[PDB]
Amino acid sequence: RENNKVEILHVTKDELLEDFEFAPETAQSGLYKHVYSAGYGQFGGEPV
Amino acid sequence: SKEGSVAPKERINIKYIPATGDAQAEVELPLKTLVVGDFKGHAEQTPLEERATVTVDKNNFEAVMRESELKITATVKNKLTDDENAELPVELNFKSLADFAPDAVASQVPELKKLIELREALVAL
Amino acid sequence: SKEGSVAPKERINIKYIPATGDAQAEVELPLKTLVVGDFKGHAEQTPLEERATVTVDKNNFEAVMRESELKITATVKNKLTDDENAELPVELNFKSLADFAPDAVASQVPELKKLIELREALVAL
Amino acid sequence: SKEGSVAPKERINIKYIPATGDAQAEVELPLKTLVVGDFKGHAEQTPLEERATVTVDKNNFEA
Amino acid sequence: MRKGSDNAAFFSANSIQKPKVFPNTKEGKEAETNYKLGTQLPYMMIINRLAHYVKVLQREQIGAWKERQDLERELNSWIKQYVADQENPPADVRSRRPLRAARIEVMDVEGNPGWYQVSLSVRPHFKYMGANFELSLVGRLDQA
Amino acid sequence: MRKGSDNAAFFSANSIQKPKVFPNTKEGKEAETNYKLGTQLPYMMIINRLAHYVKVLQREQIGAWKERQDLERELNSWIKQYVADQENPPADVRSRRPLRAARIEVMDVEGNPGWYQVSLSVRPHFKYMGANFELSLVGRLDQA
């Protein structure tokens, strides 16, 4: 009720590395999209 | 439209205007946290960028578990006998935190469930 | 045309002209490097002046490897037995850097691949 | 990397930068002494340049 | 699109034209400034309406007794109509009076009496279109 | 863990970052002060929320008629919202208004009209995180 929110994202350490190593740069990582792109960097959105 | 509607111009025009001066209204930002972790017993085939996040709160926590669908396929030492080569494989399923209680564990493991049934039969003496 | 268009002359003529004075516009030059080297397992028949250069960047590095088509035909000591005269010839192929991992090496060498299959069968006990 | 990471350029860019000015950070140097002497009952066959030094402190002296 | 709403927004209205780069000197950077203003539609619209007003209102003046400095005098008094050169005019005033400064010079077309060469240069109020922020924690900061 | 209870406590929340050492001079010690504030999460959280508020609220202002000093004026009035610069504000006030002082400077991005370069520096209230005590018995002490 105090404007607190929480989201769950299922990820193992191994596949975090998979994604970070797979992507060419951090700006194209899947996690970056969930954290930055779809939040902080989106007009009308909200920041994690 | 947030502009505010007025009538066509006449000799006498009356409009209500809120005296907020030049104050810039602002929006309160929530504190949102992201919990990242291995909440299932296996990795997903879906790419990280594709799998979605789940909003959790007090009024739906259990619902979230139910929808997430938890399952554990694992093997433990079978101590219901006296053989070191005896192993027991179980397939546990969880819908809520109550399902991690020994009561539920027994109900989902026939090798124990039947022994509980036996217990009750013996108690019924 | 970069001249800028105007209407036919009248009594009153109006034209927009950007006040850049006599300043000479200039073009920024990139820093381009040329990496020259033996990126394949063999020399090409095509003359140096004929073979072309390949532009590489972060968003297509792997694509470039795939298109370049890498192959290694080589012979190593066969240590899967106890014979000094035993030799093993392999034909490795690469599409991306991931293909240089032991995992890929095994998959492209039947003499090892089958042993990995065996390993998995033994694990399945 | 000690450079510090930033996001791709947008209309509004925000970066935290520590105000250390032009002050040059420096590293404290230890006081290390070298004790050289005949700690064994015999000379070693190993050349001086080859035999190595041993770091000693209160928590491993006996070791 | 504003996320989660029914509102959208145009953050800028750049034209097709690509900005030119000039040498990094006082003069060169001024050239860049000038050219970029030209490349953006929010400023070009000002020029466009000015062009339209000049065309119309000047045709009405054709045949009047005007000497070179007569045009300078009158054109100056005219352009002031749309200028807001105050220390800090409110956004509403800045909107209806888009210009901050203006300069007019009039010359004669030599060998053609009654014809003139006019130069009109204007400095519009600037739109806020981006910024970089540097954040820093500090001890012993002067107290605001 | 608080011995003999069911209570535990986090005495500090230092980040991973190791503090840098500077020369022992007025300026060097100020550099150390500044850098250490950066290394501790209780202060970084302040910066983080400020960053978030700036990003959001500034996007709303894009396209407004702002000159350089307009941003200085407005940004100053904004940051004051979270400042508690009293002689001795109570801990509750200090909590909801984490900053003691703040400084803002705005410059122009030369050759790019409508773009600005902003510097924001803040001095947070300090947390009590340790102390050394020297005890001494004394005769003829001035009487408190």
UniProtKB/TrEMBL annotation, chains B, C:
Taxonomic superkingdom: Bacteria
Protein name, per record: Type VI secretion system contractile sheath small subunit
From TrEMBL, chains E, F:
Species of provenance: Vibrio cholerae serotype O1 (strain ATCC 39315 / El Tor Inaba N16961)
Domain TssC1 C-terminal per the UniProt entry, residue ranges: 30-141
Name the UniProt record assigns to this protein: Type VI secretion system contractile sheath large subunit
Superkingdom assignment: Bacteria
Full-length numbering of the shown residues: 349 to 492 of 492
